[PDB]
Amino acid sequence: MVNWAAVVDDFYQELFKAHPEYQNKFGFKGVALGSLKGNAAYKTQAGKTVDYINAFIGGSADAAGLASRHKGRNVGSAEFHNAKACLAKACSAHGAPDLGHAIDDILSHL
Ligand code: HEM
């Protein structure tokens, strides 16, 4: 099993390093990046992100649903294009398969 939890941790490190303002939309707003792994809100959110990646690989991802929910947080195409870059770095850092197609599916509904 690819260590998707580790990939997602690296993903959020890249994401909030590049776009620290994105963190303000989450229950772990203002938490130092080096302490995220000890934050209960983050632990829940990272778990869901892992779940989505496993659902994509598994054939069950609902990209329309995920898209609609992100629009509900005023998160759109710009942000997801940024996330694509970050996720590609995280995957590559772990010798994991690239997830660009999953992000493209979400982007198709944004
Ligand atoms: C690699 C791209 C991303 C994936 C796979 C992803 C995945 C997810 C998942 C699975 C959820 C939970 C949805 C649910 O419970 O139904 C979520 C929620 C959320 N996402 Fe993302 N996301 C991505 C990018 C982003 C970006 C770039 C932002 C920018 C701020 C963002 C902001 C949020 C926020 C604010 C929530 C709600 C959190 C809460 O309930 O407190 N996401 N995301």
Instruction: Report resolution in angstroms.
Output: 1.8
C-alpha of residue 70 to centroid of ligand 1, in Å: 6
Q: How far apart are CA 22 and CA 63, in angstroms?
A: 20
CB 76 within 8 A of CB 110: yes
> How many domains does the chain contain in total?
1
C-alpha of residue 28 to centroid of ligand 1, in Å: 13
CB 46 within 8 A of CB 5: yes
- CA-based Rg of the chain, rounded to a whole angstrom? 13
User: What domain range is 60 assigned to?
Assistant: 1-110
DSSP string for 46-110? HHHHHHHHHHHHHT---HHHHHHHHHTTT--HHHHHHHHHHHHHHHHHTTPPP-HHHHHHHHTT-
User: CB atoms < 10 A from the CB of 86, how many?
Assistant: 21
In 3D, which of 53, 30, 54, 52 has the Cα closest to residue 42?
30
Residues with CB under 6 A from ligand 1: 22, 25-27, 45, 48-49, 52, 69-70, 73, 75, 79-80, 83, 87, 103
Q: How far apart are CA 36 and CA 47, in angstroms?
A: 13
- End-to-end CA gap in the chain: 31
C-alpha of residue 94 to centroid of ligand 1, in Å: 21
Element (H, E) at 45: helix 40-58
**Solved with:** X-ray
CA-CA distances (angstroms) from residue 42 to 32, 74, 86, 102?
Answer: 11, 20, 17, 22
In 3D, which of 105, 85, 94, 65 has the Cα closest to residue 15?
85
Angle at 7 between CA 28 and CA 100, to 5 degrees: 105
How many residues in the chain? 110
Structure tokens at 74: 């005023």
25: CATH: 1.10.490.10
